[PDB]
Paper text:
During phage infection, bacterial [name] sense c-di-[name] generated by the CD-NTase (cGAS/DncV-like nucleotidyltransferase) encoded in the same operon and signal suicide commitment as a defense strategy that restricts phage propagation. The structure of MySTING was then solved by MR using the refined model of PcSTING. Both PcSTING and MySTING crystals contained two nearly identical protomers with root-mean-square deviations (RMSDs) of 0.29 Å and 0.64 Å for 158 and 160 matched Cα pairs in the asymmetric unit, forming canonical V-shaped dimers of [name] domain. Here, our structures demonstrate that the symmetric recognition of single c-di-[name] by dimeric bacterial [name] proteins is dictated by the guanidinium group of arginine residue (R233/R230 in PcSTING/MySTING) that recognizes the O6 and N7 atoms of guanine base, the backbone oxygen and amide group (H238/H235 in PcSTING/MySTING) that form three hydrogen bonds to the Watson-Crick edge of guanine base and the aspartate residue (D252/D251 in PcSTING/MySTING) that binds to the N2 atom of guanine base.
Although no nucleotide was included in the crystallization solution, the strong electron-density unambiguously identified the bound CDN as c-di-[name]. Therefore, it is clear that the four-layer stacking interaction mediated by the binding motif (Phe/Leu)/Gua/(Tyr/Phe)/Arg (e.g., F171/Gua/Y235/R233 in PcSTING or L169/Gua/Y232/R230 in MySTING), together with the arginine residue (R233/R230 in PcSTING/MySTING) that recognizes the Hoogsteen edge of the guanine base, and the aspartate residue (D252/D251 in PcSTING/MySTING) that contacts the N2 position of the guanine base contributes to the stringent specificity for c-di-[name] by bacterial [name] proteins. Specificity for the symmetric [3’-5’, 3’-5’] phosphodiester bond linkage of 3’3’-c-di-[name] of bacteria [name] is achieved by the side chain of conserved Thr residues (T255/T254 in PcSTING/MySTING), Asn residues (N168 in MySTING) and the main-chain of I256/T255 in PcSTING/MySTING that form hydrogen bonds with phosphate backbone and the free 2’-OH of the ribose within c-di-[name]. Changing Y232 to arginine in MySTING indeed reduced the binding affinity to c-di-[name] by nearly 1200-fold in comparison with the wild-type protein. Indeed, the ITC experiments demonstrated that the binding affinity of 3’3’-cGMAP to MySTING is about 127-fold weaker than that of c-di-[name]. Furthermore, changing c-di-[name] to c-di-AMP completely aborted the interaction with MySTING. A similar arrangement of dimers along the a axis of MySTING crystal suggests a common mode of dimer–dimer interaction. For example, the salt-bridging K209 and D300 (equivalent to K212 and D301 in PcSTING) together with E175 or an additional N171 contribute two or three ionic bonds that strengthen the filament formation of MySTING.
Residue numbers in the entry:
A (entry chain B): 147 to 313
B (entry chain A): 150 to 313
The structure:
């Protein structure tokens, strides 16, 4: 029945819902809509999408993702989609050893969580306390859990998507 | 009572400002001059259009709105991200201002949050759900405007309006 209470969620839950709906699902639908995908003069019929959750929660995950992609020598790839007026931009491994197109992303939306955490702590000093680190790790775990639960509900995503932790 | 938990509109507005608004402003101010298809612009204005109604899929609503406004896609390169920015602009303007537009797709997430919050057992939106949706759209707009006030570029060149 009716519950007294205010609208309120973990930031990781809302950000993971958005990430699944507006990137994961459209990637899977694009790759399953085309009977075959071709990139850089090579054809791919099988795909894997790996979502890399950052090991530490930095406010700027765009920088962290750039560093991670550079370290792994992954390069940009553009995948067309009919669900959006601009294509999907992700990373892939041109050094793969199979006929599977291995795609990767580190969700930049995660960065926002850090801001939320700071407001929760009413931070008055420079530096991350072990309490802030604990809250960050808890949020990273919840983001991963929510994403995996959403992936389990979709046949496309369950077939081709995995979620791992950085390093 | 003292647990981490926020309005979805707050979280989504923070993400939208950091990972789109600010990077648009920074990319466009890096350029020594603004040019598209050989035309020169002396200013740019970025207009963020908040939806009138809260649909789960804001891309569809944005497509309808942009089609009504005869706005077309534009790709803006950026060094703040490993892929360029994609928004809409007015190719039929004649006044030397680069008119850029976006309807925040991230807003769609609010709908899901509200639906789970309502413990819905029937098809249809009660007036309480609609009131909550409108309140969340207002809070998204307010949070975005407060974030824009903290940046000289965004304060100067970004505006936030409601659809229609
Ligand atoms: N590697 C990669 N990741 C993607 C892509 N599309 C979405 N994502 C990821 O999914 C998250 C949610 O995207 P959104 O719901 O559309 O919510 C987006 C979206 O509403 C907007 N936004 C960001 N970039 C753009 C853009 O280039 N064009 C437009 N029209 N909106 C953008 O800002 C919001 C927040 O974006 P993020 O915090 O960065 O968070 C994004 C990002 O982590 C993609 O093409 N490539």
């Amino acid at each position: 029945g009716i519950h007294l209470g205010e609208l309120g969620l973990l930031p990781s839950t809302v950000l993971a819902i958005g990430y699944f709906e507006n990137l994961v699902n459209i990637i899977c639908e694009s790759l399953n809509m085309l009977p075959k995908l071709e990139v850089s003069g090579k054809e791919y019929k099988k795909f894997k999408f790996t979502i890399v959750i950052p090991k530490d929660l930095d406010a700027n995950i765009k920088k962290r993702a750039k560093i991670y992609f550079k370290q792994k020598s992954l390069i940009e790839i553009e995948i067309p989609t009919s669900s959006r007026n601009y294509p999907i931009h992700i990373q892939f491994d041109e050094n793969s050893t199979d006929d599977i197109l291995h795609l990767y992303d580190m969700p930049t939306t995660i960065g926002g969580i850090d801001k939320a955490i700071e407001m929760f702590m009413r931070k008055g000093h420079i530096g991350k306390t072990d309490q802030q680190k604990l809250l960050e790790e808890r949020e990273l775990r919840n983001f991963k859990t929510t994403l995996e639960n959403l992936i389990a509900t979709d046949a496309f995503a369950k077939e081709m998507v995995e979620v791992i932790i950085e390093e």
